[PDB]
Amino acid sequence: MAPSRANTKVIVVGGGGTIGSSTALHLVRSGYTPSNVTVLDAYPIPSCQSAGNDLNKIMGISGAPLSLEAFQMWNEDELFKKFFHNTGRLDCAHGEKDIADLKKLYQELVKIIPAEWLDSEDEILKRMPQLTRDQIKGWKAIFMEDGGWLAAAKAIKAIGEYLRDQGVRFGFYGAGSFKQPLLAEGVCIGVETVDGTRYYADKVVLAAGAWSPTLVELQEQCVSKAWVYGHIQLTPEEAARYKNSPVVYNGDVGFFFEPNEHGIIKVCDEFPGFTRFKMHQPFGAKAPKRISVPRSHCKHPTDTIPDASIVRIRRAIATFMPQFKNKPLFNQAMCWCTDTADGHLLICEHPEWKNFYLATGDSGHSFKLLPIIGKYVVELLEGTLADELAHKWRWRPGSGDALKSRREAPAKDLAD
Amino acid sequence: MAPSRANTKVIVVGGGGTIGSSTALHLVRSGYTPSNVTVLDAYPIPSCQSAGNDLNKIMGISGAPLSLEAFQMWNEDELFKKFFHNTGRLDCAHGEKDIADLKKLYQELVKIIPAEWLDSEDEILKRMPQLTRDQIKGWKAIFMEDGGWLAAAKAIKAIGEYLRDQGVRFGFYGAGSFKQPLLAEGVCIGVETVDGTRYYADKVVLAAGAWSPTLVELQEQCVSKAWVYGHIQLTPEEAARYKNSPVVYNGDVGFFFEPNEHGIIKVCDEFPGFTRFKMHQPFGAKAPKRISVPRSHCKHPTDTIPDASIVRIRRAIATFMPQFKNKPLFNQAMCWCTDTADGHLLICEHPEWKNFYLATGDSGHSFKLLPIIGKYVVELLEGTLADELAHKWRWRPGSGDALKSRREAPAKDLAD
Numbered sequence: 093m094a095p096s097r098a099n100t101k102v103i104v105v106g107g108g109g110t111i112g113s114s115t116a117l118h119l120v121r122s123g124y125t126p127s128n129v130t131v132l133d134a135y136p137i138p139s140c141q142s143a144g145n146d147l148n149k150i151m152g153i154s155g156a157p158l159s160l161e162a163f164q165m166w167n168e169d170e171l172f173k174k175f176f177h178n179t180g181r182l183d184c185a186h187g188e189k190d191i192a193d194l195k196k197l198y199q200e201l202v203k204i205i206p207a208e209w210l211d212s213e214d215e216i217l218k219r220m221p222q223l224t225r226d227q228i229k230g231w232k233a234i235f236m237e238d239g240g241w242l243a244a245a246k247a248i249k250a251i252g253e254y255l256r257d258q259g260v261r262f263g264f265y266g267a268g269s270f271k272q273p274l275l276a277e278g279v280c281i282g283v284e285t286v287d288g289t290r291y292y293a294d295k296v297v298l299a300a301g302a303w304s305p306t307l308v309e310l311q312e313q314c315v316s317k318a319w320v321y322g323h324i325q326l327t328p329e330e331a332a333r334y335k336n337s338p339v340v341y342n343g344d345v346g347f348f349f350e351p352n353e354h355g356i357i358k359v360c361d362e363f364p365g366f367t368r369f370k371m372h373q374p375f376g377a378k379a380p381k382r383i384s385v386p387r388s389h390c391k392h393p394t395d396t397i398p399d400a401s402i403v404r405i406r407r408a409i410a411t412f413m414p415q416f417k418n419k420p421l422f423n424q425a426m427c428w429c430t431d432t433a434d435g436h437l438l439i440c441e442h443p444e445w446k447n448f449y450l451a452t453g454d455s456g457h458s459f460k461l462l463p464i465i466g467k468y469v470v471e472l473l474e475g476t477l478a479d480e481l482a483h484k485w486r487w488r489p490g491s492g493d494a495l496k497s498r499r500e501a502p503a504k505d506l507a508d
Numbered sequence: 509m510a511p512s513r514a515n516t517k518v519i520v521v522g523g524g525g526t527i528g529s530s531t532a533l534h535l536v537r538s539g540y541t542p543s544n545v546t547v548l549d550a551y552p553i554p555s556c557q558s559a560g561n562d563l564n565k566i567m568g569i570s571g572a573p574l575s576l577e578a579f580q581m582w583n584e585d586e587l588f589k590k591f592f593h594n595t596g597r598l599d600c601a602h603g604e605k606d607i608a609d610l611k612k613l614y615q616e617l618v619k620i621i622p623a624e625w626l627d628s629e630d631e632i633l634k635r636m637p638q639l640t641r642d643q644i645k646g647w648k649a650i651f652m653e654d655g656g657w658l659a660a661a662k663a664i665k666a667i668g669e670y671l672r673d674q675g676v677r678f679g680f681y682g683a684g685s686f687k688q689p690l691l692a693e694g695v696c697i698g699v700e701t702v703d704g705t706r707y708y709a710d711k712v713v714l715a716a717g718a719w720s721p722t723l724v725e726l727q728e729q730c731v732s733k734a735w736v737y738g739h740i741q742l743t744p745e746e747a748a749r750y751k752n753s754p755v756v757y758n759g760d761v762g763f764f765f766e767p768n769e770h771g772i773i774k775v776c777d778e779f780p781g782f783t784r785f786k787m788h789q790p791f792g793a794k795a796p797k798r799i800s801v802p803r804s805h806c807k808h809p810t811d812t813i814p815d816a817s818i819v820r821i822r823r824a825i826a827t828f829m830p831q832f833k834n835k836p837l838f839n840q841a842m843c844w845c846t847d848t849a850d851g852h853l854l855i856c857e858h859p860e861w862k863n864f865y866l867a868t869g870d871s872g873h874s875f876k877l878l879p880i881i882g883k884y885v886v887e888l889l890e891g892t893l894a895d896e897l898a899h900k901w902r903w904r905p906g907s908g909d910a911l912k913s914r915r916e917a918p919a920k921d922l923a924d
């Protein structure tokens with residue numbers, strides 16, 4: 093209560109995306125005055141370039157920070173709970189390596205939630221009867237009742253609608269696209285947009301996703317990566333066969349094979365596979381430098397999707413729906429995330445611009461934190477964030493190679 | 509045979525677009541069984557490539573067929589009336605010729621509706637106080653109380669939700685994209701989509717908009733043209749000045765200068781300005797031929813707009829909002845329509861494929877018929893269409909150059 097919550101003005105940059113919309117929600121819920129909160133985005137909530145603006149994402153419990161608190165809110169929170177579909181979850185593994193690591197995951201996971209090691213092919217087929225007996229020859233599996241999918245875009249849109257009703261201020265397009273912090277004497281006092289509009293506030297959050305490293309100098313702590321996915325379509329008859337099926341994970345990769353209303357199944361590549369290095373000058377960089385900078389999806393449908401991606405996606409379809417191996421993969425697209433070297437979030441005060449805060453480093457697995465992540469960003473703004481989360485999320489330039497991250501390989505560049 | 513309405517199966521191709529959605533609505537309303545109606549579209553209603561799927565279009569009364577009737581339904585109909593905003597309409601002219609033609613229009617229009625010739629700049633500024641006094645030096649105007657804008661996308665979405673509720677069958681993507689009619693002895697019995705799905709019905713309607721001449725052979729009765737538009741963004745205080753503004757016409761072209769919630773004003777180019785001639789083989793063409801083929805907005809919202817368009821748009825911004833002449837024109841896009849030579853619709857049985865019906869020839873001015881046009885398509889199917897309308901809309905290959913149409917120039921090709 094230096095300025096009270098009630099009188100403190102906050103700009104959330106990227107407020108039409110996952111962490112940003114969460115932040116704004118939690119400001120309002122925390123007792124910030126709605127009209128004192130300004131949401132700026134290049135595109136109206138839900139942002140058409142937001143990684144979160146999807147028909148569905150997969151909600152799987154992990155060890156990761158906040159996984160279980162997020163899960164709870166998806167189940168209990170009155171805004172979020174109509175967007176989570178608890179279907180149960182099945183992690184499948186074939187071979188020495190996968191079954192080995194499935195056994196490691198099981199050990200960790202069974203301490204956190206009920207999970208069920210599935211030894212027989214019969215036990216597997218009872219949890220998901222849409223698999224065939226000889227498809228799953230040699231398979232083990234963890235079944236967990238806890239797990240499902242999230243109507244991701246709908247959830248952000250519901251945040252947007254609540255924030256509008258409460259009187260949050262909004263700026264989109266040229267009035268929303270961040271150009272620079274306003275700095276007076278090492279202190280951030282607001283934000284200028286590309287149209288020259290200047291918004292003054294006590295605190296500024298940059299929750300710009302994969303655009304974060306492109307808007308402000310992040311010293312390569314975050315490296316933006318494109319994650320390709322596509323669609324197959326099933327007839328109503330084929331679709332009906334996948335009624336009541338669970339979410340399925342091949343190691344670290346989740347899928348969901350029950351079609352939407354139009355027969356569509358979204359299948360993702362195994363990882364963010366691709367950078368788009370270009371010479372670029374984020375605010376705070378003395379000179380241009382080679383940074384991975386996203387291509388907007390509200391300005392790049394039908395962009396050259398790497399054939400490698402299409403092949404891993406077809407591999408996964410072959411594994412889990414052999415009868416559908418021949419289905420054409422259409423509406424191929426990329427959404428962008430940004431990796432830290434360690435896979436943890438970057439949620440910290442900027443080390444030079446006081447009252448400018450980073451809330452990014454999503455690392456391609458933060459949609460599920462949408463209910464809760466904004467709470468912790470508010471705690472950060474108020475200087476009450478737990479040291480454990482502060483450390484995990486700290487400013488940490490030169491703490492590792494974000495291009496590789498925790499992933500098996502460095503990402504290949506799209507230019508190639 | 510001749511089934512009852514209640515047992516007649518109808519496929520509507522382009523059912524996520526303007527005339528197609530209106531058709532499907534009028535079939536349901538007319539007493540056809542909802543599950544007997546199949547809506548097929550490349551994209552879910554409202555189609556992202558539909559010329560109808562827009563933040564707004566302008567609703568003016570004209571002499572043209574059905575104009576008054578559609579206006580009445582926009583005002584009366586429970587479904588549509590929430591998407592019509594009656595703001596009044598001001599048609600402005602400058603110069604002896606623009607004023608000469610404006611006098612022509614007054615005479616034709618005063619017969620149809622109330623209308624008010626405005627001879628002074630003071631009577632004009634009282635109808636639109638946003639205009640400056642020196643700006644409108646020399647100007648004349650017609651004011652009509654009857655006129656406003658349409659939430660076009662929202663109306664089609666409303667039709668789609670109602671159709672869904674009633675039990676209308678839908679197919680989209682590969683299951684919705686027309687490949688060919690199914691014919692048996694010169695009688696059309698259904699449709700095949702590009703995924704190979706075969707749909708069987710008694711009657712088929714092709715309401716595929718600018719794509720109609722690309723899917724079946726139309727002997728150049730319809731030529732598809734791109735119509736460019738863009739956006740300017742006003743600050744909230746620039747926006748509030750245009751509260752309560754009417755729609756404005758310079759001769760043929762309408763404008764609406766009151767910003768939406770995000771300060772955006774859409775400004776259209778003066779006409780469909782561009783063809784995309786390409787060798788293409790519609791069903792029923794023995795060989796490929798040079799036809800104007802739309803470039804989908806779903807796929808390519810990143811499309812090279814012609815500077816000529818950007819110029820004419822600037823010039824109309826300059827005319828009506830001189831103080832906003834320096835605003836950047838952004839989210840430039842193209843919307844596709846299909847012109848007949850005479851500008852009338854093409855709504856007719858195919859001359860060879862019995863029970864296959866054309867419902868196209870929108871000519872860039874048929875969004876306003878959304879409430880009513882499907883009634884006349886249903887009457888066509890039932891062989892009760894008034895001969896007056898049937899003649900106006902008839903199959904008429906070789907009846908005139910649709911490339912030029914009722915416009916001044918032939919359209920320029922986007923290749924150049």
Ligand SMILES: Cc1cc2nc3c(=O)[nH]c(=O)nc-3n(C[C@H](O)[C@H](O)[C@H](O)COP(=O)(O)OP(=O)(O)OC[C@H]3O[C@@H](n4cnc5c(N)ncnc54)[C@H](O)[C@@H]3O)c2cc1C
Nearest residue numbers: 106108109110111139143150270300301303454458459460
């Ligand atoms: C294919 C794919 C699958 C995924 N699957 C899962 C999953 O199953 N489970 C899971 O938990 N997570 C998943 N993720 C991650 C998920 O998408 C999260 O949204 C992501 O982890 C982080 O969101 P964010 O807030 O950091 O960024 P975003 O949600 O992308 O938001 C960033 C915002 O910044 C805005 N912005 C950009 N530039 C500017 C500017 N100049 N000015 C202002 N605003 C700007 C954007 O318009 C956008 O609205 C997946 C991601 C992808 C790409």
Ligand SMILES: Cc1cc2nc3c(=O)[nH]c(=O)nc-3n(C[C@H](O)[C@H](O)[C@H](O)COP(=O)(O)OP(=O)(O)OC[C@H]3O[C@@H](n4cnc5c(N)ncnc54)[C@H](O)[C@@H]3O)c2cc1C
Nearest residue numbers: 522525526527555558559566686716717843873874875876
């Ligand atoms: C810039 C611009 C401004 C305009 N302003 C106005 C205005 O102010 N007032 C007015 O009345 N009109 C206006 N119009 C015109 C209006 O948009 C059109 O006249 C009308 O929307 C066209 O309706 P349609 O059903 O013929 O085409 P659409 O509404 O485009 O419908 C065509 C449908 O066919 C589908 N389709 C395409 N290929 C296939 C396939 N293979 N299989 C199945 N489905 C397919 C498409 O996806 C789409 O849903 C404007 C047009 C433009 C371009």
